[PDB]
Amino acid sequence: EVQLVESGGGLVKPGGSLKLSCAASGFTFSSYAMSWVRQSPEKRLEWVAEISSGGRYIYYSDTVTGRFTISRDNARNILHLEMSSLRSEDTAMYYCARGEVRQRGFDYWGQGTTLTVSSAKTTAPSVYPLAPVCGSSVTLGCLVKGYFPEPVTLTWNSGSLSSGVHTFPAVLQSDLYTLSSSVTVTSSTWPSQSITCNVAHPASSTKVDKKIEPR
Amino acid sequence: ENVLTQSPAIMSTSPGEKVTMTCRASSSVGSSYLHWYQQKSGASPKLWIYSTSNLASGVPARFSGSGSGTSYSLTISSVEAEDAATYYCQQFSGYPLTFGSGTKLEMKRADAAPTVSIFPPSSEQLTSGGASVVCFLNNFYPKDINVKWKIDGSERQNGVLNSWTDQDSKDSTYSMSSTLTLTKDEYERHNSYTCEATHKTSTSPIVKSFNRNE
Amino acid sequence: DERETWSGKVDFLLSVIGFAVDLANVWRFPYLCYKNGGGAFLVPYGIMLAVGGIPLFYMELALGQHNRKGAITCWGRLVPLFKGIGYAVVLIAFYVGFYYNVIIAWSLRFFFASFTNSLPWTSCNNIWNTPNCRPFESQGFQSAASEYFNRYILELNRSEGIHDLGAIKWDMALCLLIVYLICYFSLWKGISTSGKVVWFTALFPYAVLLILLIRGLTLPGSFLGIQYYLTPNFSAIYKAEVWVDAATQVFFSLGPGFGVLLAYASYNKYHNNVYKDALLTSFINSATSFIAGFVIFSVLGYMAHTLGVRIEDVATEGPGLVFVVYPAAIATMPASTFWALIFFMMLATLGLDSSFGGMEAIITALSDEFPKIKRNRELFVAGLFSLYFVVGLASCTQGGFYFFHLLDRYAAGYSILVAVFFEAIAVSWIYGTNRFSEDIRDMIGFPPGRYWQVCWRFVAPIFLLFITVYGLIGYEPLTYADYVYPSWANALGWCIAGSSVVMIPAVAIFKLLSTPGSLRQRFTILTTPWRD
Ligand SMILES: CCCCCCCCCCO[C@@H]1O[C@H](CO)[C@@H](O[C@H]2O[C@H](CO)[C@@H](O)[C@H](O)[C@H]2O)[C@H](O)[C@H]1O
Ligand SMILES: CC(C)CCC[C@@H](C)[C@H]1CC[C@H]2[C@@H]3CC=C4C[C@@H](O)CC[C@]4(C)[C@H]3CC[C@]12C
Ligand SMILES: CC(C)CCC[C@@H](C)[C@H]1CC[C@H]2[C@@H]3CC=C4C[C@@H](O)CC[C@]4(C)[C@H]3CC[C@]12C
Ligand SMILES: COC(=O)[C@H]1[C@@H](c2ccc(I)cc2)C[C@@H]2CC[C@H]1N2C
Ligand SMILES: [Cl-]
Ligand code: NA
Ligand code: NA
């Protein structure tokens, strides 16, 4: 029915400038004031800017204003802002969200688009098989370490078995993300068949598969 | 700005139980301008309750809301597991617009100790001139848990990466991952390697371990 | 940025309620339900109010608090091609002041004449009476309540027409002056006073309406008169002329087009909810009429019961009702002197609150144009009123009614109809509804439903045009009683009708010629809003 899609975004060096755009479909766009709302890794929702339908009325946040400019294309049904002089505190996932009626709040929300503002340099991940050890069911893993920035794709056996897997969150240490994923299978299944860990990093153009056994 | 503080921040609840969350503001707010959003983990927010009382579409009627002035509350009368999420409130009473701190719902479960898997440095990672050990603590409750690494009967604490998953929507358990960062020059000096897990389940801590000789 | 604001939320409403309420609620609302077939009439009155009447009342009030300034500037800052609309509207309000304010002078003259044990107008044996006189309203004879009002109060018998005004009646003079000394000191300083004063004038009638409402229903034939008022005949639903009366009433009674609601609303806060205020003000107005409808006929039945008079004689609209028919009844009942003083006091407070908005929409309109007259309202009005007063001696003259009726049937009659039509079109088309809505969403936080603009963009013009179409069909030369107005007076009346409208094409023409550049791109300058 109603879809909103934010595009653009990615890694940006501090002071750098960028902006993304929301593609609205399924409703008459001219008649609904839009708004941009962002959410940090602390998972706290902050408002950024609102724009009226004809866009003659524009409201900004004070942590933002002057570094951010919100724009509206009704003809093509496009909403985008404009960002300049970014900070590392400007890092978040940015949401396209609409409501015309204040009394009614925000009806529909985009899928979100990530933005990471960092002086840090892009680097591709190392992937290691975690295998054991020297039982009824067995546990394995691939340790994915030393990459920047998220996001990454980690699946098992070409995304075959989704059951029994635990993919932990990345954590940043020394301007680098570490990650690992644990799965459990039947001691019969392995090593009797073969199992692969599949990592995917878009930003570094990295794509990896790997297998595990006793040695 | 009008700051909305929400309490309580984390909330554990067993199914069917009644839960209420509070949202309190620094300044008085127009009764109709308040709102409530539900955000499931790993997906965008949803509008839950608009105005103050009024529910949105697809919103089960087991949800209700109340209050005025600086005092508001969202109440889930009875709870299913499908209701586990983070809830946010918002005021349109004036610019700049503002969201509360958020209230995280997590289902309460019967206590279960972790099964601890311990994996060594990969054959490959060594060829990178370094080694790191991984401990896996899976399917336990509740979230708080403590790992302690030890080597050759000696334990010092540095360079370990601990990660806690969000709450499983299947069994409603957690999992933890602890990784010890170490050199290649190092860990050619020692042999015994140990990963311990102290939980609420057993005063006796879960002990897994490995020896460099195999 | 900063502009003065109302003392309180109420002071605003009371002003608009007061302004919008006057003797049109009394003397034309009851009579319409009667001759148009009772509560049945409330159907077409309802529809015309719903689709036609209120949307306009809403539009003038919204623009008021949004564009934040007077009628001119409000139409200046909106569509400068049409800025002339602001001008037209104001001098209309200017014109009306030459006559309308005269009514409260009659009320106070009656009021001043109401102090005594024995009322003067009950008797046919006085000096001003003629053999044609009868004690009450009769076919072919003159009621002693009419012969009082004409041969004594107005002295209108001593006038041969409009050409002969005769002598100025000074008992009226100081009465009219008293009105201006009141309207002065009400508007004398800011909305700081006037906003407070309306608490009396917009209220006091509702008090007097009550004690007359009960006193009227206690009378012997009251249960009858209400039947006359509301007894349904649904054949009228099919009558064209019924929707004309109802649509006209609905439109003329709410009062857009004098640039007042625009003016008053300007002192509103930007975010004050004016949609609620539009609906609530409307209701009170129609209600206040429907009520007094009950108040009149309960007194009317009583005359048809105890006093034994034909209904068709005493069921009437216009000043004749309140200054003749009603007081005729009252003098009969007990505590006579009491009922008079509150009735006339009510008539007075019914006029005052209304007149203020007109004078205010004039001042407020100018203050946002010429700054040093803002520096002093303060003797600006003093001239204006004394100007009113000096000219107001024409109506203070024996032929005064002939004068009065002339301005009435001409000044605001077709002038206000076309004046509004451009307001609609300019807003709904030139300015656009999309940007008119988008304005209101910033104001009250939500945009109007698909219903409202459908009234502004389509219904309203079809509605207004419908009124002037059947307005011309039913046209006759100006006449009062046996007196037919001289065609020069008719023409002179159209000048006062044309001098209002002529502002519109005047400023349209002037500006586009006074603008540089290509003729096609000098129009876009006048289509582009001040805010942009
Ligand atoms: C605050 C200022 C108050 C000023 C009042 C308004 C000015 C009115 C002046 C003309 O009216 C005068 O007074 C009476 C009307 O008020 C007239 O009738 C009166 O005539 C006798 C007055 O002595 C009484 O017996 C009658 O009841 C009464 O109708 C009277 O012919 C006339 O000279
Ligand atoms: C006779 C007295 C007592 C009451 C007069 C009736 C009036 C106030 C009623 C009759 C029909 C009503 C209208 C019915 C339809 C609507 C639609 C709504 O979206 C705006 C209000 C509006 C336009 C109502 C306004 C009030 C209304 C005009
Ligand atoms: C039967 C008749 C005589 C009763 C009339 C009662 C009168 C006094 C009623 C009718 C409508 C009422 C108004 C309705 C709305 C408001 C808005 C509020 O913010 C101030 C009071 C005010 C302005 C009310 C004042 C009292 C009021 C004017
Ligand atoms: C004289 O005509 C009026 O009384 C108008 C108006 C008005 C405007 C200016 C003046 I001086 C007097 C009345 C009051 C209300 C609102 C419109 C109409 N009345 C129904
Ligand atoms: Cl009416
Ligand atoms: Na009226
Ligand atoms: Na009035």
Q: Where are the domains of chain A?
A: 1-119, 120-215
CA A181 to centroid of chain Cα atoms: 18
Secondary structure of residue C145 in the 3-state scheme: helix
C159 token code pair = 């006038």
- ∠ CA A155-A159-A163, nearest 5°, is 85
**Cα(C400)–Cα(C396) distance, rounded to whole angstroms?**
6
C369 CB contacts (<8 Å, ≥6 apart)?
C70, C72, C73
For chain C, the domain total comes to 1
Return the closest-CA partner of residue A32 out of C6, C447, B196: C447
Q: Does B161 touch chain A (CB under 8 A)?
A: yes
Q: Search chain B and give the residue with CA nearest A58.
A: B95
The CATH architecture of the domain made up of A120-215 is Sandwich (2.60)
Give residue ranges with CB within 6 A of ligand 4.
Answer: C 19-20, 22, 24, 93, 96-97, 100-101, 253, 255, 258, 354-355, 358-359, 412
Q: Is B37 helix (H, G, I), strand (E, B) or coil?
A: strand
Q: State how far residue B5 is from chain A, nearest Cα, in angstroms.
A: 12
Q: Do B165 and A62 touch (CB under 8 A)?
A: no
Pocket test for ligand 3, best of C12, C204, C276, C284 (most atoms within 8 A of CB): C284
Q: Tell me, what amino acid is at C95?
A: Y
* Atom 16 in ligand 4: residue holding the nearest Cα: C255
Q: What is the Cα–Cα distance from C108 to C102, expressed in whole angstroms?
A: 10
Pocket test for ligand 4, best of C19, C22, C251 (most atoms within 8 A of CB): C22
Assign A158 to helix, strand or coil: coil
Query: Are B124 and B186 within 8 A, CB to CB?
Result: no
Contact between C333 and C34 (Cβ < 8 Å): no
Question: Which residue shows structure tokens 């005064």?
Answer: C400
Question: Please, are residues C20 and C289 in contact by the beta-carbon 8 Å criterion?
Answer: no
Do residues A142 and A154 make contact, with C-beta atoms less than 8 angstroms apart? Answer: yes
Which among B101, B164, B179 has the least Cβ separation from residue A143? B179
Torsion sign over Cα A201, A202, A203, A208: positive
Report the alpha-carbon distance of residue B94 to residue B1 in Å, rounded: 9
B192 Cα to the center of ligand 2, angstroms = 87
A104 contacts chain B (CB < 8 A): yes
Resolution (A): 3.3
Q: Kindly determine whether residue A139 and residue B44, on different chains, have CB atoms separated by under 8 Å.
A: no
Q: Contact, A125 vs A147, CB < 8 A?
A: yes
Report the residue among C206, C212, C213, C286 best suited for mutation to probe ligand 3: largest number of ligand atoms under 8 A from its CB: C206
Torsion of CA A204, A209, A211, A212, to 10 degrees: 30
Task: Confirm if C253 and C483 have CB atoms less than 8 A apart.
Answer: no
- The burial class, CB within 10 Å (0-12 / 13-18 / 19+), for B86 is buried
Contacts of B86 in chain A (CB under 8 A): 43
Tell me, yes or no, if A110 comes closer than 8 A to chain B by beta carbon.
Answer: yes
Q: Given the CA of residue C120, which atom of ligand 1 is nearest to it?
A: 29
DSSP 8-state code for residue C168: B
Report CB contact under 8 Å: C446, A100: yes
Amino acid at B67: G
Residue C51 DSSP label: I
Are A56 and C446 inside 8 Å of each other by CB? no
Q: Which of residues 115-144 of A touch B (CB under 8 A)?
A: 126, 128-134, 139-141, 143
Closest CA to B101 of B13, B12, B22: B22
Total length of chain C: 532
Query: Which residues make up the CATH 2.60.40.10 domain(s) of chain B?
Result: 1-109, 110-211
Method: X-ray
Which residues are near ligand 1 (CB < 6 Å)? C 112-113, 116, 120, 171
Confirm if B3 and A46 have CB atoms less than 8 A apart: no
Whole-angstrom Cα distance, residue C167 to residue C498? 30
**Helix, strand or coil for residue C146?**
helix
The fourth-level CATH superfamily of domain B1-109 is Immunoglobulins (2.60.40.10)
What distance in angstroms lies between residue C283's CA and the mean position of ligand 2's atoms? 8
- What is the Rg, in whole angstroms, of the alpha carbon atoms belonging to chain A? 22
Q: Does the CA dihedral C156-C160-C161-C164 come out positive or negative?
A: negative
Q: What residue numbers bound the domain in which C424 lies?
A: 1-532
- Any idea what DSSP says for residue A139? E
Pick from A56, A101, A102: CB nearest C438: A56
Using a CB-CB distance cutoff of 8 angstroms, which residues of chain A are in contact with residue B132?
A: 143, 145
Distance in angstroms (rounded) separating the CA atoms of residues C293 and C236 = 19
Where is B92: in which H helix or E strand?
none
- C99 secondary structure, DSSP code: T
Residue found by looking up tokens 């635990």 in the block: A166
Q: Which residue owns the Cα nearest ligand 2 atom 8?
A: C283
For residue A133, say if its preceding peptide bond is cis, omega within 30 degrees of 0.
Answer: yes
> Pairing state of beta strands B10-13 and B103-107?
parallel
- Read off the tokens for A59: 């409201």
Eight-class DSSP state of C516: -
* Cα gap C532→C530, rounded to integer Å: 5
Chains touching C by CB (3 or more pairs below 8 Å): A
Residues of B148-161 as b/e, b for ≥16 C-beta within 10 angstroms?
A: ebbbeeeeeeeebb
CA distances from C47 to C54, C231, C414 (A): 10, 19, 23
Q: Could you say which ligand is closest to the alpha carbon of residue C6?
A: 3
Look up residue C359 and give its two tokens: 């004078």
Residue C218, phi-psi category: left (phi > 0), alpha (psi -120 to 50), beta (remainder): alpha
Angle at C445 between CA C444 and CA C446, to 5 degrees: 100
Q: Where are the beta strands (DSSP E) in B92-205?
A: 98-99, 103-107, 115-119, 130-140, 146-151, 160-164, 174-183, 192-198
Joined together, the tokens standing for residue B57 give 């579409």
Q: Residues 47..86 of A with a Cβ closer than 8 Å to B: which?
A: 47, 50, 59-62
Residue with tokens 């609905």: C250
Mapped onto helix, strand or coil, the DSSP state of residue A141 is strand
Which residue has tokens 């949202």?
A: B23
Ranges of beta strands (E only) in C137-263 are: 142-143
C-beta separation of A6 from A77 below 8 A: no
Block residue for tokens 């799965």:
A183
The CATH superfamily holding the domain B110-211 is Immunoglobulins (2.60.40.10)
- The H-assigned helical ranges of C239-398 are 240-254, 260-266, 274-305, 311-314, 319-320, 326-330, 336-367, 372-375, 380-391
Q: Which of C434, C438, C446 sits opposite A57 (nearest CB)?
A: C438
State whether residue A44 sits within 8 Å of chain C by CB. no
Nearest to A52 among C442, C446, C532 (CB): C442
Cα C146 to Cα B209, C133, C150, C332, distances in angstroms:
117, 9, 6, 15
Question: How far is the C-alpha of A43 from the C-alpha of C412, rounded, in Å?
Answer: 64
Closest residue by Cα to atom 23, ligand 3, is C14
A71 backbone dihedrals φ, ψ, rounded to 5°: -130, 155
d(CA A5, CA A23): 5
CATH-assigned architecture of domain A1-119:
Sandwich (2.60)
Cα distance between residue C304 and residue B130, in whole Å: 114
From first CA to last CA, the distance across chain C in angstroms is 16
CA distance C77 to C528: 9
Q: Name the 3-class secondary structure at A46.
A: strand
In this structure, the residue with its CA closest to atom 12 of ligand 4 is C355
Same topology for domains A1-119 and A120-215, yes or no?
Answer: yes
DSSP string for C477-516: --EETTEE--HHHHHHHHHHHHHHHTHHHHHHHHHHHHS-
**Residues of chain A contacting C446 with CB distance shorter than 8 Å:** 100-104
CA atoms within 13 A on the CB side of C384: 24
For ligand 2, atom 28, name the residue with the nearest CA: C50
Of C61, C21, C26, C29, which Cα lies nearest the Cα of C45?
A: C29
Which of B189, B179, B204 is closest to B118 using CA atoms? B179
Distance in angstroms (rounded) separating the CA atoms of residues B136 and B208: 10
Q: Are A97 and B44 in contact (CB under 8 A)?
A: no
Side-by-side strand order, sheet with A206-211:
A153-156, A196-201, A206-211
Residues C237, C242, C245, CA angle at the centre, nearest 5°?
150
- The whole-angstrom distance between A159's CA and the closest CA on chain B is 19
Residue C438, chain A, CB below 8 Å: the answer is yes
- For the residues of C109-130, what is the DSSP string, one character each? HHHHTT-SSS-GGG-SSSTT--
| C-alpha span between A24 and C162 (Å, rounded) | 69
Backbone dihedral region for residue A10 (phi beyond 0: left; psi -120 to 50: alpha; all else: beta) = left
Total CB pairs under 8 A between chain A and C: 34
Query: Which residues in chain A have their CB less than 8 angstroms from residue B125's CB?
Result: 126, 128, 143
Buried b / exposed e over B105-141, threshold 16 CB at 10 Å, is bbbebeebbbbbbbbbbbeebeeeebbbbbbbbbbbb
Which chain A residue has the Cα nearest residue B103?
A44
The C-alpha atoms of residue B101 and residue B99 are separated, in whole angstroms, by 7
Q: Do B123 and A215 form a contact (C-beta atoms < 8 A)?
A: yes
- To 10 degrees, the CA torsion angle through A22, A27, A29, A31? -140
Q: Is C451 in the pocket of ligand 2 (CB under 6 A)?
A: yes
